[PDB]
Design a protein around this ligand. Structure first.
Ligand code: NA
Ligand code: NA
Ligand code: NA
Ligand code: NA
Ligand code: NA
Ligand code: NA
Lengths: 604, 604, 604
């Protein structure tokens, strides 16, 4: 009775706000405390949850402008009673359809008591039965919450409605959640995903730990799902899930877009980083209009495996990209100490993934996998895959393998050690004949580069398109042409034409070369102009060597050592000075001089 | 009276430190609590602020070695009374000029009650009237503070003095703040900037949210301003400001330098990332000596726009760099769903920005903008701009546009889709004739690359300087020269000289080519040496083909199919074996054999 | 007595858990409170430490499932008494050998009272005498702990046992700690390292500050040491230590592996980022089998110096890599305002470091250092060093210097300003003759590139291996060969062979060139084929120009302007049409026509 009076004084002090115990909460692990929570929450004061295990017979419903703070994880614990039926998340905002505003949740454990339902049980339908569900809310801060024994998800951010909407690709669901911060939270023992987002935007997930789902379906640590956009994940860890971070959508929904991963650590997940859009992977169906923009950096993947048998024994991956446009990966380290856990492909880019770049990758220990990096395309216009600055330490019988449908690949600065690999084949392999490649270095791979069946073991540099080097300006260069070592005014405008070491010299001659020349022009076919000034070759097989101010216009007509002559004869070699002075006539077997032809000569 | 005694016992327990209520604070939203705060703060104990709205009639002044902790944002709230005049920040350190030490502020709302002044009002002068001002302090930790309705800034870190110092570029202001940590803070409804730094160093800003200024001037989410240096920003979000993160200085001050952005999300700002130095942009004034070193990664920009009319309707940008030297951008995603919000340039590098690199960029949705990336230079020595691994999804009529004053550009692995763009022009365009380019891929752009007026639609690779390929060592190669497919000892030392497929062969001959040769040398002009051994061409237009141990020293003198001859005749083709044996004399029209000249021959 | 009763009511309320004061703690800076701590900790309740300085005469031992929370740093302070002897860390888990589970520590200062021992004193042996030692524990969360005046380390995570195990390289010590989170902690005035890990895995270190060791040995801010693996460090700061972040091992231990640095700021450390494996640096001893996989991004280094004389006056570094395989650095900014602090090398990659990549580097102010970036190798197979997108502002007499033992280097997009440097030499220098280089830009360096003694000041592009440009497919190209500007079916299969501007043309001729041709083949040596169709040159020095369906099989035998002839003569020029029709015989000095040889000709 005296104690009651002292407590009344303490309560009135409101040192933390109002304690739930002030409204009758026992926190004794037995008594139903729901009414105390509802009373405290409806009072308008910030609510404090002190030490205890606070049992509730139904979900805790949160109105707008709620502050709910506990004494800390495994200190303040909130828990469903054994007798609770189906349908409710443990904690969720009051207005399920159009949402609430300004909800600040901190420092307690949510224990969903899934075990009360027996084993192997997940959510009854849609977004129902997570530990924490936030639906259509603006301005929600979720901090230092531990979510355990969850029926559906640990923490779910979604749009209005108990069900998830399936409106088709290219849509935006009404009533998104917006401005959400999830920090220093933990999710484990969940039936679907640890921390997940749907149909919501402007979300930061920082320093959280999601691990060990109860089930072996599509059970992910962090699941950026249907309708998500404008999300940052940073410095989180996942462990022992299917996907570490999954970014996706189901088929009848828009894929998450514009997602940033600013560092992550994945420990013994199946597919550490798994980006996909279900239903938008086949070549015979349209591209996803939603699956776009993922920038992911400083990614760690450790011992990816499928010991638990997730997803019908799906094969492990450090990284798997499918469906998405515009995925940029920078700074990826994959490490394993057990060669038998992942034996197919370490990193895959396939199934309509397009315009993807990988830079700064180290893959170590995958000595019984078939491929380190494996890429497949669809011969799509404007597509590209860039792979640079990759080092492989006993990872992949094929280090970097490029398959069919890839027309635009850049592969630069790849190195590999294959001495510890079970039956290595090639550091780099391509199906397509025209990859761009440079900077390959290897030891212990029998072949370094296999390009469309041809092996290169002593280094290679391959570039595509019109080529120009050591020339500061030029006119047009054909894609099967080149200009090198020249000054201004040159052009090599047709297939198989080129200019070397020249000035103001142009070729429009299919199968031709101009070298060492000035103000010269080739415009027939099979033309050669060498060491000449003001030379023109304008007929098939016409040529000039060491000639000035001369034009060879004959079929197979070659001019040598001449100035100021124009020749038109077929199969003739000519020379002269201001006029034709000799001829070797291959056609008729005649030799002609303007002056004399003589034997018995000396040169003294 | 009994309650008073119970409270005395509670107070004496000091469970949090000392409560301000112990010193007479009411926290009732009405009573002036300033004396209680001052008494508690001067006591030497850590101070606790429990639930309440604590009104104050003047600024709360903080001495050295202060710990001030509240019950949490929107729980413990500190607020200026309606009657407060002008001149004071709500909370600031005691020693305004030489500063204080060891101040730890946590878990409360600061409400500046700017509305008491009417609307449209900002700070009265210098650093006066922010919610929180830290001046010349060392070791300050600011955590979980919400700053609302601010007259000047939300949170300001500055040097000693109420005014900001304007000492000119290249200076360091006395009495900096140093070792500051700002974490999980929010700033909104401010008159200038949300969270800002001036003239201070060693600062980490982490996981903060700054949004919605009251005014439409230079009102930024995060403003790294005048005199700042050695600052890290990471995992913050800005929304609805002018600049998301601005890094700059005014004209009469040194620019912030050595600044790191380790991830950021910008939502509906005008210029998400805005780096500049006012007064140091013109070509006719000197470069900033202070604007240097920005490394920014994992940057997100969403729907940049100027609907609010900030800064006289400044045009929106995902990124704008001006004035700065040494800006490195890696991993940038810009996304919009409204083509009409930003119609000028998505990313700009101009106005004395120099030595800037962009890698790993995805820009999506900017289908009515003129330029995706736009770069302008000043023909500065040692300057460079590197653009690599960029993909554009309906963003920019010109995808990557390089303007005047750029002598050194590297543009690699750019891809674009232009089918959804309003009147697309070219994926890549340059004014300068000598960009370095490779790895372009596009669909829906009428032109792929336009290089100084010339179009390339079928791929291109352009490199600058002396060129060498498939040759492990060589002597000198001129910048208008090349050596390919050769072994050691070759050189191509003058303009328009080159060596192919040779060994120990050298040319110093302007307009020349040596191919398929050994120990050969060209040293005249217009020289050709092919398939030869020990061949020398040392006069204008001299040449040798299929010759051994021979020297052509005549003007337009060609040697064919020979061994061991030296010729000097003008306009002569010669052949021989240990001595000259025939001549075709183009000059005089003579044909000469040492032995016989005959007709009627057969070859059997 | 009444106060005692009120307190009993308060205690029973358990608002924070149980206060240590409930078990008799005074927290008066004098009374020994150890028994109160032990009693509170053994009770099974979460333990709260309120305001006070809580003295203890022996270490606080932590059992499994402990929650220990204070009122905050410099609020709740825990401190060794002056009389405490040697051997114990201030706070550590109970089971030193096989460890404990689920320990959550938050919000207090640990004061090790090292000063009680006099000055210059460090730990008595192994892991003994840190402020906080965690040995063989799973699931430990360490948050907002300030560790001061530490005898050994501030915070140490290690395997079971008081000693550290020295089991040799390539081992894994029993009983690791696992799943550790260290956040918002501070360590200073320590004898060895601030925050350190040994023989443990799955660790995140976030937003911590480690600075100012008492001693000048190997005293690091963050020390990822012997046996560590799978660690992320992000957004920490180090100041005034030897290493900012050190990743290493001692000689008789395995190096830390698979470590990620997701942003860091190093202030006035000696070697900001220092990666090494003691005993595994010499060329005459084996490579580390453990030192692998470091990905480090967004790294800041400020004024590195050795004013304090750490480590026998070790020379300062922004970055030093030795021993490690697979180090990826992206986004590094080094800045100094004092040229005299670091005068040797800014960034070094040496001493068995291999397969390292640096991208996006800005180094500013190091105007009296010998080298900006300095790299040395060991001629190791599969090795590579990639340096790209680097800008230097008055940093390094040699900007990028590559030394001996490097066979595989890629150096791209390097720029430098050297006008402010004391006696600059070259932007780029290499010892090896075959670096791959492009995109160099400089001002104020007397030489731009010095490649094995040869200077290049006007730009250079150098590539290695078989070369191909403007050709979409080909057969084999030798590493001393090339194909350019050609269509399918070509090959240049031997040393010094090449094909230009041709179709279906092949050379296996050492020292050869085919240009402007179709279906042609060179298979002797010193062969030239130009502007020809169906041409074969199959003898030494054989050649064809403007020839169709012809074969030159003679020694030094040239065919000109011909169709359908096969020649075999030595030192002969021939022409013909379906049969040989003329010959110039260099061997014997004969001129032969099938028909007539005549003088007195005109061409009209
Ligand atoms: Na899932
Ligand atoms: Na899902
Ligand atoms: Na501003
Ligand atoms: Na400002
Ligand atoms: Na150490
Ligand atoms: Na150590």
């Amino acid at each position: 009775h005296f104690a009651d009076l002292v407590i009344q004084v303490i309560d009135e002090l409101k040192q933390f706000g109002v304690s739930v115990k002030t409204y009758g909460a026992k926190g004794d692990g037995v008594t139903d405390d729901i009414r105390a929570f509802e009373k405290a929450i409806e009072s308008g004061f910030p609510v404090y949850v002190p030490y205890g295990t606070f049992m509730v017979s139904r979900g805790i419903k949160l109105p707008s402008n709620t502050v709910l703070t506990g004494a800390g994880k495994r200190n303040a614990v909130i828990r469903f009673m054994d007798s609770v039926g189906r349908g409710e998340s443990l904690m969720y905002n009051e207005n399920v359809t159009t949402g609430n505003e300004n909800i600040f949740l901190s420092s307690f454990t949510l224990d969903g008591n899934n075990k009360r339902l027996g084993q192997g049980i997940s959510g009854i339908g849609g977004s129902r039965e997570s530990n924490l569900s936030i639906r259509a809310c603006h301005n929600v801060y979720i901090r230092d919450i531990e979510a355990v024994d969850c029926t559906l998800h640990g923490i779910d951010i979604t749009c209005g409605g108990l069900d998830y909407p399936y409106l088709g690709d290219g849509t935006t669901a009404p009533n998104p959640s917006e401005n959400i911060w999830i920090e220093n939270c933990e999710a484990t023992g969940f039936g679907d995903d640890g921390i997940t987002t749907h149909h919501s935007q402007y979300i930061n997930i920082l320093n959280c730990y999601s691990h060990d789902p109860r089930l072996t379906a599509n059970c992910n640590g962090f699941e950026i799902d249907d309708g998500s956009r404008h999300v940052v994940l940073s410095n989180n860890r996942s462990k022992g899930c299917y996907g570490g971070i999954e970014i996706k959508a189901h088929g009848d929904a828009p894929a998450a877009y514009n997602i940033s991963i600013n560092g992550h650590m994945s420990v013994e997940d199946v597919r550490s980083y798994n980006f996909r859009h279900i239903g938008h992977h086949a070549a015979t169906a349209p591209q996803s209009v939603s699956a776009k923009n993922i920038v992911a950096s400083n990614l760690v993947s450790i011992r990816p495996n499928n010991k638990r048998g997730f997803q019908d024994n799906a094969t492990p991956r450090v990284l798997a990209v499918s469906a998405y446009y515009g995925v940029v990966i920078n700074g990826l380290t994959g490490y394993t100490d057990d060669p038998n856990l992942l034996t197919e492909t370490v990193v895959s880019v396939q199934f309509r993934a397009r315009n993807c770049s990988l830079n700064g990758v180290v893959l170590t220990g995958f000595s019984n996998s078939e491929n380190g990096i494996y890429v497949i395309g669809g011969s799509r216009g404007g597509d590209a895959v860039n792979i640079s600055n990759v080092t492989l330490n006993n990872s992949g019988r094929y280090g970097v393998s490029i398959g069919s449908g890839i027309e635009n690949v850049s592969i630069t600065n790849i190195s590999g050690i294959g001495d510890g690999i079970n039956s290595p084949v090639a550091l780099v392999s391509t199906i397509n004949s025209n990859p761009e490649i440079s900077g390959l270095s290897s030891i212990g791979y029998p072949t370094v580069a296999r390009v469309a069946g041809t092996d290169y073991n002593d280094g290679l540099t391959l570039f595509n398109g019109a080529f120009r080097a050591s020339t500061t300006s030029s006119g047009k260069i054909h894609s099967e042409g080149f200009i090198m070592g020249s000054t201004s005014g040159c052009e090599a405008s047709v297939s198989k034409s080129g200019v070397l070491t020249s000035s103001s010299s142009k070729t429009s001659s299919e199968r031709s070369l101009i070298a060492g020349s000035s103000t010269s022009e080739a415009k027939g076919t099979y033309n050669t102009i060498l060491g000449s000034l003001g030379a023109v070759a304008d007929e098939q097989f016409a040529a000039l060597i060491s000639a000035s101010q001369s034009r060879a216009s004959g079929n197979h007509n070659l001019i040598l050592s001449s100035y100021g002559i124009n020749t038109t004869g077929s199969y003739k070699v000519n020379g002269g000075f201001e006029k034709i002075n000799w001829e070797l006539d291959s056609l008729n077997g005649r030799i002609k001089a303007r002056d004399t032809v003589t034997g018995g000569n000396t040169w003294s």
